[PDB]
Every structure is written in C-alpha cells, then in structure tokens.
Design an enzyme around this catalytic site. Structure first.
Site, mmCIF file in Angstrom:
data_model
loop_
_atom_site.group_PDB
_atom_site.id
_atom_site.type_symbol
_atom_site.label_atom_id
_atom_site.label_comp_id
_atom_site.label_asym_id
_atom_site.label_seq_id
_atom_site.Cartn_x
_atom_site.Cartn_y
_atom_site.Cartn_z
ATOM 1 N N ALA A 59 31.962 -1.056 -16.054
ATOM 2 C CA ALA A 59 32.616 0.032 -16.787
ATOM 3 C C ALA A 59 33.929 -0.459 -17.449
ATOM 4 O O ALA A 59 34.273 0.093 -18.496
ATOM 5 C CB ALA A 59 32.752 1.156 -15.828
ATOM 6 N N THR A 101 36.612 0.380 -21.220
ATOM 7 C CA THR A 101 37.910 1.062 -21.053
ATOM 8 C C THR A 101 38.717 0.949 -22.353
ATOM 9 O O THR A 101 39.299 1.974 -22.721
ATOM 10 C CB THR A 101 38.663 0.602 -19.813
ATOM 11 O OG1 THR A 101 38.835 -0.805 -19.736
ATOM 12 C CG2 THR A 101 38.023 1.138 -18.538
ATOM 13 N N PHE A 152 35.166 3.826 -13.184
ATOM 14 C CA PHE A 152 34.902 4.639 -11.983
ATOM 15 C C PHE A 152 36.039 4.485 -10.946
ATOM 16 O O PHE A 152 36.432 5.482 -10.292
ATOM 17 C CB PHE A 152 33.498 4.308 -11.478
ATOM 18 C CG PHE A 152 32.458 4.789 -12.454
ATOM 19 C CD1 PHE A 152 32.042 6.108 -12.416
ATOM 20 C CD2 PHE A 152 31.873 3.927 -13.382
ATOM 21 C CE1 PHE A 152 31.158 6.604 -13.356
ATOM 22 C CE2 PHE A 152 30.912 4.417 -14.263
ATOM 23 C CZ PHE A 152 30.569 5.750 -14.263
ATOM 24 N N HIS A 203 21.361 1.036 -14.419
ATOM 25 C CA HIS A 203 21.677 2.443 -14.061
ATOM 26 C C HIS A 203 21.162 3.397 -15.121
ATOM 27 O O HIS A 203 21.424 4.608 -14.947
ATOM 28 C CB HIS A 203 23.183 2.655 -13.734
ATOM 29 C CG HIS A 203 23.617 1.796 -12.589
ATOM 30 N ND1 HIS A 203 24.955 1.579 -12.252
ATOM 31 C CD2 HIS A 203 22.855 1.048 -11.748
ATOM 32 C CE1 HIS A 203 25.017 0.753 -11.236
ATOM 33 N NE2 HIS A 203 23.683 0.352 -10.939
ATOM 34 N N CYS A 257 3.249 7.686 -20.944
ATOM 35 C CA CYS A 257 3.076 6.303 -21.474
ATOM 36 C C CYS A 257 4.250 5.369 -21.123
ATOM 37 O O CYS A 257 4.111 4.169 -21.368
ATOM 38 C CB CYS A 257 2.865 6.290 -22.988
ATOM 39 S SG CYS A 257 3.800 7.536 -23.918
ATOM 40 N N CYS A 271 6.581 13.399 -26.112
ATOM 41 C CA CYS A 271 6.217 12.063 -26.639
ATOM 42 C C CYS A 271 5.444 12.189 -27.964
ATOM 43 O O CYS A 271 4.594 13.076 -28.077
ATOM 44 C CB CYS A 271 5.378 11.322 -25.615
ATOM 45 S SG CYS A 271 5.249 9.556 -25.976
ATOM 46 N N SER A 318 33.582 -4.106 -10.311
ATOM 47 C CA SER A 318 34.091 -4.243 -8.931
ATOM 48 C C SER A 318 32.991 -4.743 -7.990
ATOM 49 O O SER A 318 33.382 -5.168 -6.900
ATOM 50 C CB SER A 318 34.775 -2.991 -8.355
ATOM 51 O OG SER A 318 33.895 -1.859 -8.282
ATOM 52 N N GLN A 331 41.153 -5.533 -10.870
ATOM 53 C CA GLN A 331 41.225 -5.316 -9.407
ATOM 54 C C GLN A 331 40.463 -6.410 -8.665
ATOM 55 O O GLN A 331 39.658 -7.102 -9.269
ATOM 56 C CB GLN A 331 40.583 -4.006 -9.031
ATOM 57 C CG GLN A 331 41.302 -2.835 -9.617
ATOM 58 C CD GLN A 331 40.561 -1.558 -9.360
ATOM 59 O OE1 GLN A 331 39.317 -1.502 -9.335
ATOM 60 N NE2 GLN A 331 41.336 -0.511 -9.160
HETATM 61 N N1 LIG Z 1 40.096 -3.881 -19.830
HETATM 62 C C1 LIG Z 1 39.771 -4.304 -18.598
HETATM 63 N N2 LIG Z 1 39.743 -5.653 -18.387
HETATM 64 C C2 LIG Z 1 39.365 -6.089 -17.168
HETATM 65 N N3 LIG Z 1 39.063 -5.371 -16.075
HETATM 66 C C3 LIG Z 1 39.014 -4.061 -16.332
HETATM 67 C C4 LIG Z 1 39.408 -3.457 -17.515
HETATM 68 N N4 LIG Z 1 39.271 -2.076 -17.360
HETATM 69 C C5 LIG Z 1 38.774 -1.898 -16.158
HETATM 70 N N5 LIG Z 1 38.709 -3.060 -15.441
HETATM 71 C C6 LIG Z 1 38.214 -3.234 -14.036
HETATM 72 O O1 LIG Z 1 36.832 -3.001 -14.101
HETATM 73 C C7 LIG Z 1 36.291 -2.628 -12.812
HETATM 74 C C8 LIG Z 1 35.149 -1.690 -13.058
HETATM 75 O O2 LIG Z 1 34.573 -1.281 -11.778
HETATM 76 P P1 LIG Z 1 34.017 0.139 -11.386
HETATM 77 O O3 LIG Z 1 34.897 1.269 -11.856
HETATM 78 O O4 LIG Z 1 33.695 -0.005 -9.925
HETATM 79 O O5 LIG Z 1 32.653 0.249 -12.246
HETATM 80 P P2 LIG Z 1 31.202 -0.502 -12.079
HETATM 81 O O6 LIG Z 1 30.583 -0.728 -13.411
HETATM 82 O O7 LIG Z 1 31.423 -1.636 -11.128
HETATM 83 O O8 LIG Z 1 30.533 0.754 -11.379
HETATM 84 C C9 LIG Z 1 29.202 0.564 -10.882
HETATM 85 C C10 LIG Z 1 28.502 1.889 -10.893
HETATM 86 O O9 LIG Z 1 29.140 2.764 -9.961
HETATM 87 C C11 LIG Z 1 29.204 4.099 -10.481
HETATM 88 O O10 LIG Z 1 29.007 4.956 -9.423
HETATM 89 C C12 LIG Z 1 28.168 4.091 -11.606
HETATM 90 O O11 LIG Z 1 26.812 4.124 -11.195
HETATM 91 C C13 LIG Z 1 28.414 2.696 -12.189
HETATM 92 O O12 LIG Z 1 27.309 2.163 -12.902
HETATM 93 C C14 LIG Z 1 37.485 -2.171 -11.974
HETATM 94 O O13 LIG Z 1 37.674 -2.983 -10.828
HETATM 95 C C15 LIG Z 1 38.691 -2.283 -12.958
HETATM 96 O O14 LIG Z 1 39.791 -2.848 -12.328
HETATM 97 O O1 LIG Z 2 33.359 14.549 -16.103
HETATM 98 C C1 LIG Z 2 32.116 13.919 -16.264
HETATM 99 C C2 LIG Z 2 30.895 14.627 -16.194
HETATM 100 C C3 LIG Z 2 29.666 13.964 -16.352
HETATM 101 O O2 LIG Z 2 28.487 14.731 -16.271
HETATM 102 C C4 LIG Z 2 29.675 12.534 -16.601
HETATM 103 C C5 LIG Z 2 28.484 11.696 -16.788
HETATM 104 C C6 LIG Z 2 28.650 10.271 -17.029
HETATM 105 O O3 LIG Z 2 27.509 9.483 -17.203
HETATM 106 C C7 LIG Z 2 29.964 9.756 -17.084
HETATM 107 C C8 LIG Z 2 30.481 8.325 -17.289
HETATM 108 C C9 LIG Z 2 31.757 8.130 -16.783
HETATM 109 C C10 LIG Z 2 32.471 6.938 -16.864
HETATM 110 C C11 LIG Z 2 31.824 5.875 -17.453
HETATM 111 O O4 LIG Z 2 32.500 4.689 -17.451
HETATM 112 C C12 LIG Z 2 30.496 5.985 -17.896
HETATM 113 O O5 LIG Z 2 29.884 4.850 -18.454
HETATM 114 C C13 LIG Z 2 29.843 7.217 -17.855
HETATM 115 O O6 LIG Z 2 30.965 10.567 -16.888
HETATM 116 C C14 LIG Z 2 30.878 11.881 -16.667
HETATM 117 C C15 LIG Z 2 32.119 12.559 -16.494
HETATM 118 ZN ZN LIG Z 3 4.157 9.366 -24.109
#
Ligand SMILES: Nc1ncnc2c1ncn2[C@@H]1O[C@H](COP(=O)(O)OP(=O)(O)OC[C@H]2O[C@H](O)[C@H](O)[C@@H]2O)[C@@H](O)[C@H]1O
Ligand SMILES: Oc1cc(O)c2cc(O)c(-c3ccc(O)c(O)c3)[o+]c2c1
Ligand SMILES: [Zn+2]
Length: 281
Positions: free
Chosen positions: A44, A48, A55, A124, A135, A157, A200, A226
């Site tokens: 994610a 940003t 997250f 995801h 299909c 579809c 993360s 982080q």
């Molecule tokens: N510009 C930046 N440069 C470098 N690091 C960054 C920046 N901005 C943010 N960060 C770091 O980027 C990190 C992002 O980590 P996380 O927020 O855990 O996201 P995921 O993709 O791992 O979340 C996984 C899944 O969990 C959810 O439930 C959904 O299912 C997601 O798909 C942090 O440690 C920030 O410090």
């Molecule tokens: O406040 C909300 C409500 C939603 O239903 C969401 C659904 C999403 O898929 C995401 C979302 C949030 C942060 C991300 O970095 C991302 O890729 C999706 O945010 C919501 C927020």
């Molecule tokens: Zn179909």
C-alpha cells in the site's frame, strides 16, 4: 472489521541518513545488475504518494481506526495517478529487468499503469476487476466495482454465457486466487532477487513469498519506512520513500521513468526493449 486481527499498526518510521541512503541504493543497483530473475513485491506504501492511505503506517486505515479517527483520501480510486514507483516498474519490465510483479494492492494502479497482467499477481484482488462465476472471464472496468467479498455486482457475462459477475476483493476468510498465488509462488521460488516496496509483510501467505527467494541462496531487499515482519531476513533494508529510492535506482540503471498516458490495460507483456550495457562490478 471485528474478528479481523490487523497485525501491528502505527510503528515508528525509520529514515536512513542521506549518505547511507545513497550507498544502499548503489548496492540495490549492483544486485539488480548481478541478478538473472528479479521479482518485485508491492504493498500500500507505493500508492501513498498518489493520495491513497496505507493500512498500518502512521495515518493508515487500521492505525487511524485504532485511535478512533478516519483515514483520509486525497483522491478517488478513479482519479488516482500511478506514482513514479508504478511507472519505474513498467519500464523495468519493458527492458526485461523485472521477471514478475506480486502485489497485495487492490487499488488498480498497476493495471491502469500499463503493467502487463500476465506478469502481475494481484493476491488481494483488484477493485476495477469483476469475474464471471461461470466462465471465470475477468472484466477490467474504468470505474470501481461497487462490492467487496466476492459478491454479485449486478452485471452479467457478455461472452460468445450470461454468468453472474462478482468482485475480486477477498474478505478476511477468503482463500487467495489460486492462479495468482501459484504464479507468485513459482516466480518467488525461482527468483535470485526479491525486492519488497511499501509492504510491512504481515499477511500470510502474501508477506512470506519474498522469504521463498532466500531458499537456494536468493537475495532479499526490503524498501520500507517502518520495520517489517521479515527485516532479520533481508540482505539490504532501505528506510526511505519508495519514489526517491526508485528514481535514484533508475538513474543508476540509465533508465527513464516513462510518461503515463491515462488508464490503459495491457493483457500480455510486449517483446523486450533495448537496455543499457552493464557496469563491471
Ligand atoms: N512513500 C512511502 N515510501 C516507503 N514506505 C512507505 C511509503 N508510504 C508507506 N510506506 C510504508 O508502507 C508499508 C505498507 O504496509 P501496510 O499498511 O501493512 O500495507 P500492506 O500492503 O502490507 O497491507 C497488506 C494487506 O493488509 C490489508 O489488510 C489489506 O488486505 C492489504 O492488502 C508501511 O509499513 C509504511 O511504513
Ligand atoms: O473507509 C473505507 C471504506 C471502504 O469500503 C474501503 C475499501 C478499500 O478497498 C479501501 C482501501 C484502503 C486503503 C488502501 O491502501 C487500498 O488500496 C484500499 O479502503 C476503504 C476505506
Ligand atoms: Zn461468463
């Protein structure tokens, strides 16, 4: 939203000092040059700089939820522009320096960036992608698909079928898509280098795929503000903004970050373009 365990949220940021950051990005260059198979893992933190909150960062969706505040969007999904990181990855695939890209991001930006879908795994799902239950035909829309948790969208579809169309966004209890996980796992086992950008690494199995590259001697680079669940396992940890890291890397590699033309979908990777000659290392 209740049953869900959100891992660790709002840990402190680390910034490498500028001469350590410069040194470490040269070593990331050297490793890209030495490698035969490079896989990139994104979360994610690459989006940003496009206005989309993460997250678990200091203002992440879950971090803010823990403190009773809202996350803040500075864009819609539809009006979000791919970052420098996003466009760096497009180019690195086009000149054959990236074998495969594995992303936990549901934000749609890889696909809209022009990144070829046959080199991408979206563990995801994708908020702009709906899939026929019958299909399994996937539809990449110009607008976000209005449901999450693999629900009926309302749409049928349109193949050669009339199957019910559903979102690709995993609920907490949903298995990861079998195709995407199969390919991400294979690319991760065969890589000699895995580079983690803006994740993360706290979600299993998504966050463990880069560990698979260390089996049979592969190298692991984690780029993240982080700490991450697997810092201990990293040959190289870069604490910096991914945009600043990827723009210095591309300059070391002699590559330009190309223009974004607006939302475009590429199903299949194009033939490889020229790339600069390698330095002696
Ligand atoms: N510009 C930046 N440069 C470098 N690091 C960054 C920046 N901005 C943010 N960060 C770091 O980027 C990190 C992002 O980590 P996380 O927020 O855990 O996201 P995921 O993709 O791992 O979340 C996984 C899944 O969990 C959810 O439930 C959904 O299912 C997601 O798909 C942090 O440690 C920030 O410090
Ligand atoms: O406040 C909300 C409500 C939603 O239903 C969401 C659904 C999403 O898929 C995401 C979302 C949030 C942060 C991300 O970095 C991302 O890729 C999706 O945010 C919501 C927020
Ligand atoms: Zn179909």
């Amino acid at each position: 939203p209740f049953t869900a365990d959100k891992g660790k949220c709002g840990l402190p940021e680390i910034f490498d000092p500028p001469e350590e950051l410069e040194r470490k990005v040269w070593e990331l260059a050297r490793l890209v040059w030495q490698s035969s198979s490079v896989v990139f893992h994104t979360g994610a933190g690459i989006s940003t700089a496009s206005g989309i909150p993460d997250f678990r960062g200091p203002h992440g969706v879950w971090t803010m939820e823990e403190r009773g505040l809202a996350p803040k969007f500075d864009t819609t999904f539809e009006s979000a522009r791919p970052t420098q990181t996003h466009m760096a990855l497009v180019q690195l695939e086009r000149v054959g320096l990236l074998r495969f890209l594995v992303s936990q991001n549901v934000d749609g930006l890889h696909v809209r960036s022009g990144f070829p879908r046959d080199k991408l795994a979206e563990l995801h799902g994708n908020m702009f992608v709906e899939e026929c239950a019958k299909c399994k035909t996937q539809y990449v829309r110009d607008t976000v698909v209005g449901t999450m948790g693999l629900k009926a969208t309302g749409r049928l579809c349109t193949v050669a079928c009339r199957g019910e169309l559903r979102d690709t966004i995993l609920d907490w209890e949903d298995s990861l898509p079998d195709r995407d996980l199969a390919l991400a796992d294979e690319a991760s086992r065969n890589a000699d280098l895995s580079i983690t950008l803006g994740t993360s690494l706290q979600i299993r199995p998504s966050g463990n795929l880069p560990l698979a590259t260390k089996r049979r001697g592969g190298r692991l680079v984690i780029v993240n503000l982080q700490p991450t669940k697997h810092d201990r396992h990293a040959d190289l940890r870069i604490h910096g903004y991914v945009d600043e890291v990827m723009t210095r890397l591309m300059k070391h590699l002699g590559l330009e970050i190309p223009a974004w033309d607006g939302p475009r979908v590429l199903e299949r990777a194009l033939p490889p373009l020229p790339r600069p000659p390698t330095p002696k290392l």
